[PDB]
């Protein structure tokens, strides 16, 4: 209850899936890292938007339908899960490096939970 994401890693067996695996481990016994560590540590020093009425209107609709679909299905979710649903999109705008909570961030936040739950 104090955690949010319980990713259950599958290991299903498909003949194109494992064949693709078999060469890629083999090809490595013989976009960059230090740029990546700079980008995040620069993005810890930029301002935090939190504020757009448009993005908060769509996510609560996005909550209510699964609020009809959590209890008649797999896993009951709680009010603190909404504090995730702001927080993922809040950090997703931190990837954007902007001060406007857009619309596009609210689509990846819903879709990430949909695989996490289904």
């Amino acid at each position: 209850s104090r955690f949010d994401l319980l990713f259950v890693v599958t290991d299903d067996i498909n003949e194109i899936r494992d064949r693709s695996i078999s060469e890629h481990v083999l090809r490595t016994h013989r976009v960059t890292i230090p740029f990546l560590r700079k980008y995040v540590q620069y993005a810890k020093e930029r301002v935090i938007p939190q504020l757009t009425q448009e993005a908060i209107n769509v996510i609560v609709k996005n909550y209510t339908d699964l609020r009809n679909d959590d209890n008649t299905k797999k896993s009951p979710i709680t009010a603190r899960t909404l504090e995730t649903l702001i927080r993922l999109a809040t950090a997703h705008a931190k990837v954007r490096l902007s001060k406007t909570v857009n619309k596009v961030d609210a689509k990846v936040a819903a879709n990430l939970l949909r695989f996490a739950l289904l």
């Binding site: 990713f7 890693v9 290991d11 976009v31 620069y42 927080r87 950090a91 931190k94 954007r96 490096l97």
Partner: protein, 210 residues
């Protein structure tokens, strides 16, 4: 034993009274000068010491100029003089099997290293805005993270989403909420559940885990 170089005749005294007069001595403490004193033990960087021993340690006395600079868990690099002190063999009699030569370092100028301070120029700060203009770079960063493993792009975006971090706005005269993010995994074995857990520590930006 703080002048760092000259072994002078010590003054085994705390405070004198009654100089050669009949005057009760007074001391001005605003014009008396002070300094601090802090010892810290340094382990061994436990990757380049070859596998025949546990890590060893020595210690270093520094001064005011770089105190509180040393958080426990920093790749530090110090430089100073090598120095022995203490009487070994005479201060007690018969002195059998007692070292009396303590290793000390009375040094200067530590530096954190990285293998917090990374100053970048106008060039790279502009290019990172220039690639910020692309509307795909959230996806490129996901695929450019773990260069060994196929797929799991739902997992791969989550790690970079967690590592960068979401804020917590503290309530004024009220309890702040959870602004930390805390993800979890589980999986049937040998499916790279512990693979990606060890390379988050290399790019950790001063986040040393157990």
């Amino acid at each position: 034993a703080t002048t760092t170089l000259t072994t002078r005749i010590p003054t085994p005294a705390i405070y004198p009274t009654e100089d050669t007069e009949g005057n009760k001595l007074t001391t001005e403490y605003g014009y008396s000068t002070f300094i601090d004193h802090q010892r810290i033990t340094v382990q061994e960087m436990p990757e380049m010491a070859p596998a025949g021993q546990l890590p060893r340690s020595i210690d270093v006395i520094l001064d005011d100029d770089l105190v509180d600079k040393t958080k426990p868990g920093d790749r530090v690099n110090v430089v100073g003089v090598f120095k022995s002190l203490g009487a070994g063999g005479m201060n007690q009699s018969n002195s059998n099997t007692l070292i009396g030569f303590k290793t000390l370092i009375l040094g200067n100028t530590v530096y954190p290293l990285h293998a917090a301070r990374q100053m970048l120029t106008d060039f790279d700060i502009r290019n990172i805005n220039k690639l910020s203009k692309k509307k795909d770079i959230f996806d490129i960063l996901s695929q450019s993270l773990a260069p060994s493993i196929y797929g799991h792009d739902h997992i791969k975006k989550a790690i970079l989403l967690m590592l960068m971090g979401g804020v917590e706005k503290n309530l004024e005269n009220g309890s702040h909420l959870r602004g930390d993010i805390n993800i979890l995994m589980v999986g049937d074995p040998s499916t790279a559940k512990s693979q990606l857990l060890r390379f988050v520590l290399n790019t950790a930006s001063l986040a040393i885990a157990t």
